Design a protein around this ligand. Structure first.
Ligand SMILES: Nc1ncnc2c1ncn2[C@@H]1O[C@H](COP(=O)(O)O)[C@@H](O)[C@H]1O
Ligand SMILES: [Mg+2]
Length: 311
C-alpha cells in the first residue's frame, strides 16, 4: 500500500463550517486538500456552511476527509448526515463522535471498562451547591477541576484550590451546563497525549504548559507551551500508555483517528481526561508532528487516514 489513488474516487475535504473553530478548520482543510492532491487523489474543498450538503451525493463524491472542528463537525451531526447521504468519512461515527464530546458519559464508560480516569463527582443545576461542595471535598480533597460534562458550555475549566471556593465554582458552572464534572486534580507528574492514526506507531507527546495547567492561554495565546517528543517516559511505560490509549478510544466507539489525553500522577499512574475525535491538521498541529517523528510525512499521514474509509 501502495494504494492506487484512483481507488479513492472523488473526495471532498470538509472545511470551514459555522463553528467558533472555523479558522483552524480552514487552515487544516487547505493543508489536507494539498496533502491529498500531492498524492494524486481527486480531492476538492467542500465547505458545508456555503454549499448545500446534498451536493456531496448529487455531485458524486464517494468519501470525505473531515477537517471540521467544533459544533456539527465534531459532535455526530454531520457524521449522521453523511451516513444518511451514503458518503464515507474519516474519523468516528455518530456514537463515537457524540460520546467523545460528553465527558460525563465517557468517564462512566471508562470506569466500567477499567480505563483509568480521575475520580469524580457530579453536580446538577438546582443542587445545594454548598452542601455538594462539602461532600465532594470530603471525598476527593483539593485541588479539584470543575468542568462541563457535556458539549458545548461557555464556562472554561476551573482549578479550585480551596474548599471555600468550591460552591461559587459549582454554581457558575451549573449556570451553563445542566451537568458539572468535579475531578480530583492529578498532581505530581506530567501531561501527555497519544495520537492515533490507523495502526501507525506514533509516539506520545508530553505537553508542558508554562502556567498552572493546559488552559486557553497555554493552548492559544502563550508562545512557550512545549510539545515534547521524546515524551521522557521509559520505553515500557510509553508502550503501555499507548495501548491503554487505544483501548480508551475503542471502548467509546471511536475509530482510530484522534488523540487520547491523559495525566500522570507522582507515582506514574495514568488518568485519561478525554478523547479528541477531530484533531488539528495545521502545520503546527500534533498529529503531523507525531507522524514526522516516525518518518511519516504530512501527505502520507492524510492518505493513511483516508485509506481507512476504503473497504
Ligand atoms: N483532573 C485533572 N487533573 C489535572 N489536570 C487537569 C484535570 N482536568 C483537566 N486538567 C487540566 O486542564 C486541562 C483542560 O481540561 P480539559 O479540557 O477537561 O481536559 C487539561 O488539559 C489539563 O491541563
Ligand atoms: Mg475542540
Amino acid at each position: 500500500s501502495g494504494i492506487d489513488p484512483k481507488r479513492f474516487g472523488k473526495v471532498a475535504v470538509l472545511l470551514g463550517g459555522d463553528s467558533a473553530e472555523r479558522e483552524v478548520s480552514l487552515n487544516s482543510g487547505r493543508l489536507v486538500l494539498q496533502g491529498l492532491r500531492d498524492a494524486g487523489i481527486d480531492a476538492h474543498p467542500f465547505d458545508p456552511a456555503q454549499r448545500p450538503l446534498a451536493a456531496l451525493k448529487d455531485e458524486g463524491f464517494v468519501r470525505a476527509f473531515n477537517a471540521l472542528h467544533g459544533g456539527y463537525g465534531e459532535n455526530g451531526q454531520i457524521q449522521g448526515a453523511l451516513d444518511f447521504y451514503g458518503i464515507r468519512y474519516t474519523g468516528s461515527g455518530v456514537l463515537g463522535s457524540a460520546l467523545g464530546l460528553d465527558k460525563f458519559r465517557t468517564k462512566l464508560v471508562w470506569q466500567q471498562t477499567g480505563i483509568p480516569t480521575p475520580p469524580f463527582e457530579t453536580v446538577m443545576r438546582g443542587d445545594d451547591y454548598a452542601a455538594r461542595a462539602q461532600d465532594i471535598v470530603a471525598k476527593l480533597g483539593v485541588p479539584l477541576f470543575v468542568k462541563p460534562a457535556s458539549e458545548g458550555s461557555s464556562v472554561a475549566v476551573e482549578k479550585v484550590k480551596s474548599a471555600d471556593a468550591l460552591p461559587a465554582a459549582l454554581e457558575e458552572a451549573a449556570k451553563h451546563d445542566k451537568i458539572v464534572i468535579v475531578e480530583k486534580s492529578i498532581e505530581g507528574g506530567g501531561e501527555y497525549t497519544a495520537c492515533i492514526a490507523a495502526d501507525l506507531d506514533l509516539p506520545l507527546i508530553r505537553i508542558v504548559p508554562a502556567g498552572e495547567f493546559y488552559d486557553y492561554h497555554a493552548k492559544y495565546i502563550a508562545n512557550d507551551t512545549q510539545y515534547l517528543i521524546p515524551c521522557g517516559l521509559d520505553a515500557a511505560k510509553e508502550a503501555e500508555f499507548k495501548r491503554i490509549a487505544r483501548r480508551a478510544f475503542d471502548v467509546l466507539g471511536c475509530t482510530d483517528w484522534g488523540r487520547a489525553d491523559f495525566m500522570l500522577d507522582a507515582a506514574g499512574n495514568p488518568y485519561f481526561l478525554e478523547v479528541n475525535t477531530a484533531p488539528g491538521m495545521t502545520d503546527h498541529s500534533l498529529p503531523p508532528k507525531a507522524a514526522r517523528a516516525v518518518g511519516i510525512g504530512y501527505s502520507e499521514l492524510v492518505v493513511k487516514v483516508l485509506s481507512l474509509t476504503l473497504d
